[PDB]
From TrEMBL:
It comes from bacterium HR29. This is Poly(Ethylene terephthalate) hydrolase. Keywords: Hydrolase. Its EC number is 3.1.1.101. The lineage of its organism: Bacteria. It comes from the Bacteria.
Length: 259
């Protein structure tokens, strides 16, 4: 009934580890692409199905490896994830959003044949960490056709983003690089009230929480991406009536919890 439904029925523990799909990677060379500095694509193997695309941006001075695990994680649960390298490690959120748009264009038009065989170009989303999360919000403004957006401990001088693209903002309670009361929380509060939006706050986490395998980040990112890129209602259960002990705060306009 749902053509985009992938994988078995999800349980929460199954979302804290790699999914049913085997993952292959492709190394997008820095000089083989214009508009961004290459990166790594993670895509399912041993399957003839098609999956939505995700473009991921690391943060200031960081590179794609800082999100490698995550680029793998979503991939094993049924996605084509391209975690980008930027032209400069000192690029700022708007440049990173431009490079994310470039990476999505590459994924749709110039990716290898094996990647292109697994990609549904009509279902795309974006994720990022810090200045990459701010870029996530900015591109959600620029490309309103995106299915979802997941900014992880986002950072941006601008706190207001007018986007209809559903956003799941992860903030780290103890973050001193991008404090939540200055970034994640104001960004959630300034998102349009019609846009479906979730704010999860990882209890006692610091700014580098998304740079290694994290149970809560994995669960909520997979849930958001499944709910919006795959229209997969089976994951609504993890995003509604939440009592997660790893979280120090959960906010939502609860527009995703309805039928």
């Amino acid at each position: 009934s749902n053509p985009y439904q992938r994988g078995p029925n999800p349980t929460r523990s199954a979302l804290t580890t790699d999914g049913p799909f085997s993952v292959a990677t492709y190394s997008v060379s820095r000089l083989s692409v214009s508009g961004f500095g290459g990166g790594v694509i993670y895509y399912p193997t041993g399957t003839t199905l098609t999956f939505g695309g995700i473009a991921m941006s690391p943060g200031y001075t960081a590179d794609a490896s800082s999100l490698a695990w995550l680029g793998r994680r979503l991939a094993s649960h049924g996605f084509v994830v391209i975690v980008i390298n930027t032209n400069s490690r000192l690029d700022f959120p708007d440049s990173r959003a431009s490079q994310l748009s470039a990476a999505l264009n590459y994924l749709r038009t110039s990716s290898p044949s094996a990647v292109r065989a697994r990609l549904d170009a009509n279902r795309l989303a974006v994720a990022g960490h810090s200045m990459g999360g701010g870029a996530t919000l900015r591109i959600s403004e620029q490309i309103p056709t995106l299915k979802a957006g997941v900014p992880l401990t986002p950072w941006h001088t601008d706190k207001t983003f007018n986007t209809p693209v559903p956003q799941l903002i992860v903030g780290a309670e103890a973050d001193t690089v991008a404090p939540v009361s200055q970034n994640a929380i104001p960004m959630y509060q300034n998102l349009p009230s019609t846009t479906p939006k979730v704010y999860v706050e990882l209890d006692n986490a610091t700014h580098t929480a998304p740079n290694s395998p994290n149970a809560a980040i994995s669960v909520y990112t997979i849930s958001w991406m499944k709910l919006w890129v795959d229209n997969d209602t089976r994951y609504r259960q993890f995003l509604c009536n939440v009592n997660d002990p790893a979280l120090s705060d959960f906010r939502s306009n609860n527009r995703h919890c309805q039928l």
